[PDB]
Design a protein around this ligand. Sequence first.
Ligand SMILES: [K+]
Ligand SMILES: [K+]
Ligand SMILES: [K+]
Ligand SMILES: [K+]
Ligand SMILES: [Mg+2]
Ligand SMILES: [Mg+2]
Ligand SMILES: [Mg+2]
Ligand SMILES: [Mg+2]
Ligand SMILES: [Mg+2]
Ligand SMILES: [Mg+2]
Ligand SMILES: [Mg+2]
Ligand SMILES: [Mg+2]
Ligand SMILES: [Mg+2]
Ligand SMILES: [Mg+2]
Ligand SMILES: [Mg+2]
Ligand SMILES: [Mg+2]
Ligand SMILES: [Mg+2]
Ligand SMILES: [Mg+2]
Ligand SMILES: [Mg+2]
Ligand SMILES: [Mg+2]
Ligand SMILES: [Mg+2]
Lengths: 263, 186, 229, 80
Amino acid sequence: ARGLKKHLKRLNAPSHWMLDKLGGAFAPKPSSGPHKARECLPLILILRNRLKYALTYREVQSILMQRHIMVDGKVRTDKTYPAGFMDIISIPKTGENYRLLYDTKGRFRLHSVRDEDAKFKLCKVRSVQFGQKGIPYLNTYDGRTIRYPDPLIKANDTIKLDLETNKIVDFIKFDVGNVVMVTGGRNTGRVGVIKNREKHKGTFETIHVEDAQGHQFATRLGNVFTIGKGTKPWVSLPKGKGIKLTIIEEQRKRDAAAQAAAK
Amino acid sequence: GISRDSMHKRRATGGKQKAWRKKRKYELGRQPANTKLSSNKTVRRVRVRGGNVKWRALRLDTGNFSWGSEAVTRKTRLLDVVYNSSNNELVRTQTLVKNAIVQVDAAPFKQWYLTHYGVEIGKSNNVQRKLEKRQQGRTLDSHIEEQFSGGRLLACISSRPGQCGRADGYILEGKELEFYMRKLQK
Amino acid sequence: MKLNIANPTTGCQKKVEIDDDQKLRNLYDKRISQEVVGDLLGEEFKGYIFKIMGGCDKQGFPMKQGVLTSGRVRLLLHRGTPCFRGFGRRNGERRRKSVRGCIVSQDLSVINLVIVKKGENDLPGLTDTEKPRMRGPKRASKIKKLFNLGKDDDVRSYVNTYRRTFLNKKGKKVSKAPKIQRLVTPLTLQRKRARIADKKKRIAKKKSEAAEYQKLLAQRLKEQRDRRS
Amino acid sequence: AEQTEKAFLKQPKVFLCSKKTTKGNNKPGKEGNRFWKSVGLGFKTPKEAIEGTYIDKKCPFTGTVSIRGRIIAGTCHSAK
RNA sequence: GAAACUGCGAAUGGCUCAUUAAAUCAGUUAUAGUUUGUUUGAUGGUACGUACUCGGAUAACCGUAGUAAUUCUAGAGCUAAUACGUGCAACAAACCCCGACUGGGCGCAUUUAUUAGAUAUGAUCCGAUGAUUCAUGAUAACUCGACGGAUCGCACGGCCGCCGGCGACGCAUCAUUCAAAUUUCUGCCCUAUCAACUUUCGAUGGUAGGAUAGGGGCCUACCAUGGUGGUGACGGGUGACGGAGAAUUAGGGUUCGAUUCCGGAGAGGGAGCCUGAGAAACGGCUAC
Ligand SMILES: [K+]
Ligand SMILES: [K+]
Ligand SMILES: [K+]
Ligand SMILES: [K+]
Ligand SMILES: [Mg+2]
Ligand SMILES: [Mg+2]
Ligand SMILES: [Mg+2]
Ligand SMILES: [Mg+2]
Ligand SMILES: [Mg+2]
Ligand SMILES: [Mg+2]
Ligand SMILES: [Mg+2]
Ligand SMILES: [Mg+2]
Ligand SMILES: [Mg+2]
Ligand SMILES: [Mg+2]
Ligand SMILES: [Mg+2]
Ligand SMILES: [Mg+2]
Ligand SMILES: [Mg+2]
Ligand SMILES: [Mg+2]
Ligand SMILES: [Mg+2]
Ligand SMILES: [Mg+2]
Ligand SMILES: [Mg+2]
């Protein structure tokens, strides 16, 4: 009340952190970092609860202190560091370069990308204005800021950003006909192609997207993330990429029963 | 202490509002600086929210005043306070606040005018070949020029002395000046 | 009224207790930092002058410099000032304590005197006992200021004051010496050069990026050959 | 005139004593000019605000106040 | 490596529901009206008018004590800094002014004023919003400017003394994250045996200031007479913290909601305040 809060109750944790209700009174509060602490997956919830590498809040530390975790091309030790979207969690030694992608149910998935594809990432772009001494800068959506950007780059764009030599390799503008993945709300994790953008003077830029399998859905100007030019994404999607409503999930379970086992 | 809450005020319906909490620090107030025009300058540092610093000027004698028409800013000493829009006892007490009319000596401005326009009021070839160019458009208001002989120019304070610790301002000209002259003449 | 006599030059402290009113009247209106002649307060103090710089009441309450005629008053003292210590208190925390004014009177149970003038008559105690201390200063410039030295003649080979002779309980002779705290080594110069090199790297990168962005805008101007060609 | 108080009323950051001409200078409020702005949201600035002599720092068109938030329609109740 | 100095934390958590009936609170807004230790990314040329590295203290320690007394307290002698305080800031360019006939300014920060930020001499650069004199640039000056590394670890190397790596801590600006503060609209139980309430002394509005991190009668001077009300103001009761929710439920509904999740408020009752990025803090102080 008189200041900041350093505790996060388990029942107050974000939903995509599927945490057992009777597992404790507290959840790991995400540290300050590049991502918004509600759309992030802390490292504690990576070496635990997603991989069986660590078993407690004592071996996550025991393997972070060995400097074994390299997120976004940099060794990180803070166990509650907020890896939030498409961050390259590159585990050295064993080589587990993982892109944090959005499951069709709003979850977080560690898509195992190849090593040479793990040397870059992509970032969404916030406003672009003039800095001190009249030097334009980028100010992406994951805390990153890049000075001297190419003048074609504008707001809401996406940039393919290198890691070892941090410079913009190329970029995709925000326009209709581009692959887009939704990263917020109920439509999280659904890829599609923008059909038209509707503009309301004052607020609420609404984007209408067409799914590959024929479905259509709308969302805000936020929560969307351009992925690739035209209809070809620049990254490997985890699987499915379609909403897959409950009935067809039941059908998949049925055919899994009727095949494979089939007995 | 002094607070800025609406807690003690009354509703727009004229009904008394009760109290459900104590006073809070983040809504405090402080005593006014009550800056004075005096020769013994004194400015005291204040520590404000966030750890930043406010400069509370208790006494000032000089200032940074700008002639907008010629766009020249000079440091000069204030001589008197002649008008105060809000309170008529703030000129009797000679209190430096924003929008308070003051008088500043014209010596720096006379010196700049002489060395720039080549004209005194109140070298081989380049300087003379450039001086008449500035003398071609040289024009001054009669009310502006009549104060150089007197040695003091009417001016207005645009800074907040109790906040920035300084008294800067601009020289009164045009439609402003006579409006105050008709208020200062008697 | 007990007196704590301290020989600051090279001596020690001692307690002198006297009770006769005539001798203890001369120091009955003086204040802190006032001089008192030794003869007036008694014999054996001919060439001696004492300075008043302390004293406690009959209840242990201290004497605070700057307060008027002796009378117990209450002051809102700050931490770390005389007559108020910290030792487990919040940083910006004050406290109201009880002090007495610097004026000396009969309401004092002890008074601290320091010897200013050596005099000529000895005192058994704080006149012959010569004692060492910890090491001389461990700073670099405070060695060359103690052994008179020039710019050269490094102080590394100058610690003759090894505090030896602390013979170990296992019958082992080990020596202890401090560590110089401002000595210039090649490491410090390396750090200075590293800082300079970092500044050079920043100054180079800035102009490199500016030149490349100027080239990019030149290419954009070449692209502007398509608005109307 | 518009000056009906014990202080001169002027538009901030609008120099009223420049010797150079006007009436053709962009951003009205330059080289001596009434300062006015469009509030956006599809609202038209009245001609009485552009070609006006009043001074109002709380006016949305020729003042220091920007319109953002909620837009509400209603009827005037009391204008005294 | 004990102790001690220095830094950081103790403003989270825990407990309770007394006050509080458009007030807290819920959904939904706004900051173009602000502050933000910290985390992440980027960015630090002007000191010049001993730099192979400046100065004085002080704790632990040791020894003289006072008091019935307490992490009550006074003297003496030593000694450190990433404590405190000074000071080379190491080496530029561009530009703005005053100017020798054919020199001063200028890092970053602060305050004020002027000015560019266009339309949309043939060939002709110039961001952003629904919306700004906006982002930013140039200019004139201003400030007694806690700013612009006198700091630590590991590894040792390459050039004739020169140069050099990987880290730690620290200062400043911007963006981000963690947040708060204030704020838009709508919504609450019973009572008319509560019908007018508020305003000279702030009640509603205006002008100019003061104060605040910042908007605002938040406060001051002057001015105007306004503001709410049978669509229940004002006043009273509550054995009234608000919500998510609980019980019973054909449907509708009725009753409850101190309590583990969110928000608010309190540390016996009021008030004032220091430190700190953050408190009107009470396992902090001062007073009654
Ligand atoms: K603290
Ligand atoms: K609300
Ligand atoms: K305010
Ligand atoms: K602190
Ligand atoms: Mg908006
Ligand atoms: Mg400590
Ligand atoms: Mg709490
Ligand atoms: Mg009531
Ligand atoms: Mg309301
Ligand atoms: Mg601007
Ligand atoms: Mg105001
Ligand atoms: Mg009044
Ligand atoms: Mg109650
Ligand atoms: Mg409740
Ligand atoms: Mg209980
Ligand atoms: Mg609670
Ligand atoms: Mg409280
Ligand atoms: Mg009790
Ligand atoms: Mg309290
Ligand atoms: Mg307690
Ligand atoms: Mg507490």
